[PDB]
Amino acid sequence: QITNLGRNIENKSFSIIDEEAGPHSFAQEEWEVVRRIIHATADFDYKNITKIHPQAIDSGIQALKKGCPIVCDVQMILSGLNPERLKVYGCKTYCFISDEDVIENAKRKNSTRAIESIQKANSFNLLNESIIVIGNAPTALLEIEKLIRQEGIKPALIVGVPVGFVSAKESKESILKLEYYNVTSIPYILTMGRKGGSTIAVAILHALLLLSSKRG
């Protein structure tokens, strides 16, 4: 998994982050997630924009335990998750961003591959009680919002951390509006604003997998 020197570096880093982050309003478990994000980016700003839903970590753990599907918008996210830890639960990862049918459908429908990618997962019922990890494409998050609002889909958890200058900020706010209006109570983990990234998403997933293990 990692060497002694490895752990020493990480432990030293987390200690530096805690001391430097200063005062924050995150509970212990929530902080393990936020601290992980700051660690992957060296960006303390995440201490202020990462919003975690009260049931987020709980639904996340439960979903993983059940070998739930993990739907990712971009391939890099998967490339960050070690299949070793996932087979423990039997979770299955998916990313259709690069499938032919998705590509042609995006072109033909004047949309994005991310949007058709999400629709494809839905056509397979892969959104129900799953963990939706959107680390890059804002349109993928807006589509999920659309499906929740119109199709009533019920994922176990939404990790909405897309990065961008066009609709990123908006896609995250649309998720908060769903809760604001009590149309649904789908747990979420968001980094409000334009900031996000596949690396932020992977860091959140790893924090969850760790918390899951630690709960033992």
Give the integer Cα–Cα distance in Å for 162 and 186: 18
Confirm or deny that 123 is annotated as ligand binding: no
149 is in an annotated binding site: no
From the list 24, 39, 53, 206, the catalytic residue is 39
Domain segments of the chain: what residues?
1-216
Pick left, alpha or beta for residue 193 (phi over 0 → left; psi -120 to 50 → alpha; otherwise beta): left
Q: Cα separation of 190 and 46, whole Å?
A: 10
DSSP β-ladder status, 69-72 and 92-94: parallel
Residue 24 a catalytic site member:
no
Q: Which experimental technique did the depositors report for determining this structure? A: X-ray
Overall size of the chain counted in residues: 216
Contact call for residues 195 and 49 (beta carbons, < 8 A) = yes
Q: Which amino acid is at 120?
A: K
**What is the resolution of the experimental data for this entry, in Å?**
2.3
69 pairs with which residues across the strands? 92
Consecutive H or E run containing 160: strand 157-160
CATH architecture of 1-216: 3-Layer(aba) Sandwich (3.40)
